[PDB]
């Protein structure tokens, strides 16, 4: 088992709305949960977009999840990662 490296990035403000992307990388096995929370609670999957869990060419995997958030509300959001019975949480930077 290799634990994921989790990283949160944010795009520029489109129309007062930021896109936040939570990336998990360099993990094994392939089974992972990666999802956005607001005010400590998981969002609906219909408010998010997920990449596939793809190889990185080193015997490990990588994936991502994104959601759109209104400007000034970024501190309410947390990326939740779960892998092999472990979890980690990651707030929105800047």
């Amino acid at each position, epitope marked *: 088992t290799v634990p994921p490296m989790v990283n949160v990035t944010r795009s520029e403000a489109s129309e007062g709305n930021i896109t936040v992307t939570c990336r998990a990388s360099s993990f094994y096995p392939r089974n992972i*949960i990666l999802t956005w*929370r*607001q*005010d*400590g*609670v*998981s969002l609906s999957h219909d408010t998010q977009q997920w990449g596939d869990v793809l190889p990185d060419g080193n015997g490990t995997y990588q994936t991502w999840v994104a959601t759109r958030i209104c400007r000034g509300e970024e*501190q*309410r*959001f*947390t990326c*939740y990662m*779960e892998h092999s*019975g*472990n*979890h*980690s*949480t990651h*707030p929105v*930077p*800047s």
Partner: antibody
Amino acid sequence: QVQLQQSGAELVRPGTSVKVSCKASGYAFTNYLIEWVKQRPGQGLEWIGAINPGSGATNYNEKFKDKARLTADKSSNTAYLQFSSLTSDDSAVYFCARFLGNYFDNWGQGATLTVSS
Amino acid sequence: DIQMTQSPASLSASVGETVTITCRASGNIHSYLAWYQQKQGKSPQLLVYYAETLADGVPSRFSGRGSGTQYSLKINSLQPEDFGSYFCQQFWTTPYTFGGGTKVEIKR
């Protein structure tokens, strides 16, 4: 309405194990992460770890990885913190808390753990 | 690991005075900081989150300010119910870390 009610004071022997509880009410138990915190008078507040009561998946402070075990029983809305190989260093007040949007709220009343022969 | 440096460790003030408690983080915590009150080691009570947002039910005399690595809690017109302990906590990275606390005692 939201309440985290912990178990009472514990008087326990060195070398033994003990499990203290945190019973949640007034909200959907599986939706929020439960947090555990240690407090002593000498060396301040320390975060032990978090658990997702929906899946049981844990996020430990590396310092408590050998000492602490976090579990949750979602049928009784109760989270647990178990200590192994108790020493005098474990004598402290232990709090549970609730993870909101990137801050803690709804701290339990605390449970005192006293290790003694 | 973010180290939180809270000063001063103790503070003597009278009713009506204004007091300020500072917390300095070892790295940028992006305003993910909360302040809590604690009386006699009892349940911590949330005062301020996201560095400056005052929590529900908290008197407007409490004021949180800061960004980056520099944060402060100000108590304007200190009341008898404000004597006790205060601590900051950061939520930018795990493990979550706490300031060493400030005991606010009655000056005489």
